[PDB]
């Protein structure tokens, strides 16, 4: 079991670009909490770290500038999305997170088949790579848009699904 991790229900994210995924605001606030504290100290949102953490503790104490600070925190960074069971390596993929309202994780359509993910209620786990090395590995090697073909066959794995096919064929 592991820190800097979360989970939630998944929801279709048609507007997302392939390298993106929708992350609920509260989830991102918790997963990135130390970075958010440090950024709040870099700006005028808090005098120090402990004040900022006590400020985030209660939900009614949370104001609007902390969300912009969190947006600045996650810029360029990626998270790992994983669906159980993990049958091959594409059961974990890397996505730039987009902060969204609501409590559901938003998943890009073209990766669903890889995860064997549909939207009858599946849930997914989120992980935060911490080091520059971990984030570099995730962005170069584990990014969704960098893994387009199956390592088993070599045929396209991210490709048009039934909904996409239905329109283009039509």
């Amino acid at each position: 079991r592991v820190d800097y991790s979360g989970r939630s229900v998944i929801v279709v994210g048609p507007q997302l670009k392939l390298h993106q995924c929708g992350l609920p605001k509260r989830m991102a606030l918790e997963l990135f909490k130390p970075f958010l504290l440090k950024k709040m100290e870099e700006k005028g949102i808090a005098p120090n770290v402990k004040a900022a953490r006590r400020m985030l503790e209660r939900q009614r104490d949370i104001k609007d500038e902390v969300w912009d600070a969190l947006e600045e925190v996650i810029h360029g960074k990626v998270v790992l999305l994983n669906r159980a069971p993990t049958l091959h390596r594409l059961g974990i993929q890397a996505f730039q997170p987009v902060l969204v309202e609501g409590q559901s994780i938003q998943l890009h359509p073209l990766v669903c088949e890889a995860f064997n993910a549909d939207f009858d209620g599946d849930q997914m786990a989120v992980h935060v790579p911490l080091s520059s090395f971990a984030q570099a590995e995730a962005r170069i090697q584990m990014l969704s848009a960098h893994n387009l073909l199956s390592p088993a066959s070599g045929e396209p794995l991210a490709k048009p699904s039934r909904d996409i096919i239905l329109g283009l064929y039509y």
């Binding site: 049958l87 091959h88 390592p151 088993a152 070599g154 039934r162 909904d163 096919i165 064929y169």
Partner: protein, 221 residues
């Protein structure tokens, strides 16, 4: 432009058998013993089954459900076994420099034993695409050099030469013949099938192999 027809033809949803159950007859059914019932469901789902037809179909439905359930666990056990044998195998060097290789045949003996006939395209691809030639191959006025990573066009050209009768089998570097210790070299492995290019040294090829073999384990009927 019928919806069922459009979806089935495009590949968005559905296969001829589900379409047949919707529009045609439901078909034959199995007894619990695997034995087949003599009288089939003449009804479709459009028309509606009788309670006897429905009850007869319940046998096969339950049998398939129990099949899937009992299958997932054995598939997972197999996958973990494979991960345990293959995990130390990594691409550790560019070339072990072996002269050994395997010969992928392009023809297989007919079940009639009449002659040899061309293998199915997909199987030739699965045995050739992204591999490295261990010897020079000259076919249809084309030179496929030793050490060449065979692209898909290379495979299709080799198939054309086979159909023209110019080559019956392809020599190729393979993990079976690799003399690299604790792993495999770049030439013997060939492509990184995900990137359609030569494999990067350091790729954990054994785990990829185990997962590639394991993942479609729950589809095996």
């Amino acid at each position: 432009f019928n919806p069922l027809y459009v979806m089935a033809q495009s590949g968005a949803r559905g296969n001829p058998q589900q379409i047949r159950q919707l529009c045609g007859l439901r078909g034959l059914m199995q007894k619990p013993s695997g034995e087949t019932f003599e009288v089939p469901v003449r009804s479709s789902f459009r028309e509606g089954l009788t309670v006897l037809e429905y009850f007869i179909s319940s046998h096969g439905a339950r049998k398939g459900g129990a099949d899937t359930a009992l299958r997932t666990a054995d598939s997972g056990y197999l996958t973990r076994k494979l991960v345990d044998v293959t995990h130390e195998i990594v691409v550790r060097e560019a070339d072990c420099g072996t002269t050994n290789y395997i010969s992928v045949p392009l023809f297989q003996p007919d079940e009639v034993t009449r002659s040899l006939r061309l293998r199915k395209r997909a199987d030739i691809e699965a045995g050739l695409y992204g591999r490295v030639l261990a010897r020079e191959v000259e076919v249809l006025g084309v030179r496929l050099e030793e050490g060449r990573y065979l692209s898909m066009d290379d495979v299709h050209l080799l198939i054309k030469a086979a159909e023209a009768g110019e080559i019956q089998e392809v020599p190729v570097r393979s993990p079976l013949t690799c003399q690299t210790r604790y792993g495999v070299c770049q030439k013997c492995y060939g492509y990184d099938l995900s990137m359609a290019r030569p494999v990067s040294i350091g790729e954990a090829v054994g785990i990829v192999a185990a997962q590639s073999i394991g993942e479609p384990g729950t589809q095996l009927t």
